[PDB]
Amino acid sequence: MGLEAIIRKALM
Amino acid sequence: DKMQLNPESADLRALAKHLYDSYIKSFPLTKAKARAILTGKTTDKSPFVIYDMNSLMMGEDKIKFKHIQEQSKEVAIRIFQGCQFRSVEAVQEITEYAKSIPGFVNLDLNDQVTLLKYGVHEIIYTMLASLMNKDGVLISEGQGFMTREFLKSLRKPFGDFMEPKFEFAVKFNALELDDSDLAIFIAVIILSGDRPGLLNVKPIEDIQDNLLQALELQLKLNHPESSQLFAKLLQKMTDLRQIVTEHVQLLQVIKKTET
Ligand SMILES: Cc1c(C)n(Cc2ccc(Cl)c(O[C@@H](C)C(=O)O)c2)c2ccc(C(=O)N[C@@H](C)c3ccc(C(C)(C)C)cc3)cc12
Secondary structure (H helix, E strand, O other): OOOHHHHHHHHO | OOOOOOOOHHHHHHHHHHHHHHHHHHOOOOOOHOOOOOOOOOOOOOOOOEEEEEEHHHHOOOOOOOOOOOOOOHHHHHHHHHHHHHHHHHHHHHHHHOOOEEEOOOOHHHHHHHHHHHHHHHHHHHHHHHHHHEEEEEEOOOEEEHHHHHOOEEEOOHHOOHHHHHHHHHHHHHOOOOHHHHHHHHHHHHHHHOOOOOOOOOHHHEEEEEHHHHHHHHHHOOOOOOOHHHHHHHHHHHHHHHHHHHHHHHHHHHHHHOO
């Protein structure tokens, strides 16, 4: 969840 | 002369309108709706104002940045944990907005993550200026207002935490940009071709040049008094990277001595 899994999550 | 109503100029006004519509649905609290709260031009029950420790302790007996809490009884860190909380929420709001940028989803998926990785900080600080004035900043989706001096009255590491953002917001809000200017300006920040690790730099720049054209025409039509405002707004993109640098240098102190 280090700002890269969050963006990856929001980018479905 | 130069500016004319050709099919090319209309396509730039359609892009500005398209980006504006997605700017409203992606980001709930816009500037126009935030300036009406700050200037009392609205009738939204007059949100709370936190101006000292007594107004903070009393103001927390109403739903605020204590969403989930019993963490960090100390108010200097609890406020900082609220800023990072909505910052994560802002990442999802910016990412949802980025999907509406024409050609952003068509890029490489790893480049989409890279553009947003090094871009959210500069956009979070840009959109935060819309919530600020010389007195403070709107908090909790406009339902609160924490003053600039109370934030500066915190301890040594946390007191100078919000101040660089206020100093940027004063000069940035003096440009008098509206949501139609900021929507295109935010899209330009995302499509930066100088981000570290970008695989395909050319198609990113091809979108940014298209966004710059739309941003240029926008500021010329919307701002007849401020000549070279398109030039001044690009220089602000260098002010933003210093706020990110000062924020990172502030995080070094947290790892050094904050246990
Ligand atoms: C988005 C945002 C808002 C709306 N305000 C006003 C504000 C004032 C006071 C309180 Cl207490 C507050 O909190 C609750 C009331 C709320 O927001 O409603 C909110 C901010 C103030 C500072 C920062 C920041 O500088 N954040 C830094 C530390 C960071 C952290 C993490 C990231 C990534 C997730 C991209 C890694 C990026 C920047 C961000 C924000």
